[PDB]
Design a binder for these strands. Structure first.
Length: 454
RNA sequence: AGCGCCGCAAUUCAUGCUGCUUGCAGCCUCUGAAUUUUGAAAUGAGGGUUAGUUUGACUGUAUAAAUACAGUCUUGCUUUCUGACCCUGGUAGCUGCUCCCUGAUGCUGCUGUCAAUAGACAGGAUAGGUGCGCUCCCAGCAAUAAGGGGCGGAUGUACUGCAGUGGCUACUGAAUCACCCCCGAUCAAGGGGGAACCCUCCAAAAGGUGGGUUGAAAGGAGAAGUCAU
DNA sequence: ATGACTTCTCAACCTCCTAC
DNA sequence: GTAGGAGGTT
């Protein structure tokens, strides 16, 4: 639900970058391409066309002969792990797309393929003599890498180092299931210029981080969920490898109860009856209402001009840019609408926290096309009362001047920002032919009625 | 003139205002919602220029909670706007076509000085518009196997025109800056000096010691297909 | 060939081989 | 002999 990627840049002298480029681009990327092709020619793919699922063992079984091949001989085992993880994720995504929508598919790109680290223990964080946080992976451990990141992400790497030190200083009595780092990706940003490829492309890292583990009080929720899941797994499981796995899990239960020296923050105890609802239209991208769901009195309405206070110019800039790109496309992305959606999501979450709202509701994407069409028809009727030609011309001009808002990105941003504090995301039926504040209030009451029925 | 945007005034009000009657009454000082009008405040600028400031993390005190204060550490990632800065270009190579009239469509439009003019030299984004941009109009322009008229070269129904049009690449020039300069580093590291303002001490004053200011925001990433034209 | 949608994913303990 | 690095394995 809540998993935040953390950016960093790995910096070292020339020999390290040269070794990484000569070991990944020359070996690892062709290795991944070979796995892709060889599973493409696998006879079971047609069988995998019948049902959209993949065994977790066949990929490793196919990759095992290539490990001993002289072409792909020199590489750490964790990098083979990375290659098979990448091919498994890619083919699982392909199978999921094929199943939902119900053949060579090699990626065409100049940059080398990412290195994925599913095991968080692979990277070893160590403070440098100067004060930086050198990091090295499982394998190629003597090629260190200083991390560069902003002050807004330095605490994540500091807690990576702190968690590793607490694990090492406790004689491995702590568990890695509570580590705030889960997954890692090593790529290049394709720095523009001229020179050697290893000395030209900036090497960067993405660290998948679970925010629910940030606070000591929040770690308890993750601990309880993991304990319940693994207890269900072990009670369903009840064979040498199976016995080894069950003993590992039963040791993980004992290991997960150890205390971590983490900051403690009060959990967001939002009132279950104070709903906050978001309504999306075309004349105004979003309006917010706060209701009590017990006494039908609205605590606060909020227009988009208040959520974007001191930033409302950016909405007009986004609309102008969208019109310009539409005109250019008709004649033959600035990544600003995403920023606007994130601003709106943060403003709505801050509003809900300030008014002590325990649940945020926002409409589904399925009804959005009908909502846009109804809004266009309603505004055309409001402008031109009765004659069809006037409403049609006004609707055409209005749609040409201003386009839709790409609401799904806003939905994702709201969900991601609400998962940070712990506000329940809910859906509701968008009402038709009403004021945006009236629409938001009716959506909130409909959501409360649906929750009452459930 | 149609449409879209800012806020100027007015009206109805609250998501606002005080006392509570804590749910009803009045009001528009502030913050905002809906409608009409409107060209004195705002939106609005052609191409780029940063290891760019802040929006950070932790520990305590107060608000029972938003939040503020005090202390410690600090880092440079993907962005987003404002402000400031240089130019509206110079070289070489490769490469599509071809005319008189009539188009759809599309491009250009700043200021000053010589030349009627093409074309040169300066300034310089306040770049043709109602306050502001646009698939909208205001002018000029424009190429082609879009239509028509063909002419010469030319034996032929055969081919060319009747010096201009677009695209690509390498070397490349100015900013390589968030008060402004100097030096230095550009997979690494900053150092030095100076102007204005504010606070405190010394201090008759002038001045000197110590500190700060000289913009503000947001963050989930990887790979893939799908759809619409 | 170009902007949104979406479904996948976001491991964890254990064992063997060095070092002074 | 404990601490750290490389590899397994579902």
């Amino acid at each position: 639900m809540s998993q935040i990627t953390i950016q960093a840049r790995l910096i070292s002298f020339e020999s390290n970058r040269q070794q990484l480029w000569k070991l990944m681009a020359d070996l690892n990327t062709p290795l991944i391409n070979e796995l892709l092709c060889q599973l493409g020619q696998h006879p079971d793919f047609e069988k995998w066309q019948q049902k959209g699922k993949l065994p977790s063992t066949v990929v490793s079984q196919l990759c095992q002969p290539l490990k001993t091949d002289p072409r792909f001989a020199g590489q750490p085992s964790r990098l083979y792990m990375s290659a098979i993880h990448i091919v498994d994720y890619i083919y699982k995504s392909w199978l999921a797309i094929q199943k939902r929508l119900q053949i060579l598919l090699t990626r065409s790109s100049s940059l080398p393929f990412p290195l994925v680290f599913e095991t968080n223990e692979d990277m070893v964080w160590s403070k440098n003599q100067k004060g930086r946080l050198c990091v090295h992976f499982n394998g190629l451990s003597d090629l260190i890498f200083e991390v560069y990141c902003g002050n807004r992400q330095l605490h994540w790497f500091q807690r990576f180092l702190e968690d590793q030190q607490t694990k090492r200083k406790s004689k491995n009595q702590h568990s890695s299931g509570l580590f705030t780092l889960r997954n890692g990706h090593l790529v290049w940003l394709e720095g523009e210029g001229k020179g050697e490829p290893w000395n030209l492309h900036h090497l960067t890292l993405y660290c998948c981080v679970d925010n629910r583990l940030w606070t000591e009080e929040g770690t308890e929720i993750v601990r309880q969920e993991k304990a319940d899941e693994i207890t269900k797994f072990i009670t369903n499981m009840k064979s040498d490898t199976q016995q080894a796995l069950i003993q590992r899990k039963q040791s993980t239960l004992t290991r997960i109860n150890n205390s971590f020296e983490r900051p403690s923050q009060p959990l967001y105890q939002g009132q279950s009856h104070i709903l906050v609802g978001v309504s999306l239209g075309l004349e105004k991208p979003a309006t917010v209402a706060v209701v009590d769901a017990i006494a039908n009195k609205v605590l606060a309405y909020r227009s988009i001009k208040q959520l974007l206070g001191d930033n409302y110019e950016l909405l007009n800039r986004q609309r102008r840019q969208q019109q310009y790109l539409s005109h250019e496309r008709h004649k033959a992305a600035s990544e600003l609408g995403q920023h606007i959606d994130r601003l709106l999501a943060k403003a709505i979450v801050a509003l809900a926290r300030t008014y002590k709202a325990g649940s945020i509701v926002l409409p589904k994407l399925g009804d959005m096309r009908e909502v846009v069409q109804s809004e266009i028809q309603a505004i055309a009727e409001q402008k031109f009362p009765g004659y069809i030609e006037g409403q049609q011309k006004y609707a055409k001009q209005y749609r040409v001047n201003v386009h839709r808002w790409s609401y799904g990105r806003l939905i994702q941003s709201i969900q991601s920002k609400a998962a940070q504090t712990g506000i329940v995301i809910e859906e509701g039926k968008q009402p038709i032919r009403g004021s945006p504040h009236d629409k938001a209030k009716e959506l909130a009451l409909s959501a409360y009625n649906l929750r009452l029925t459930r």
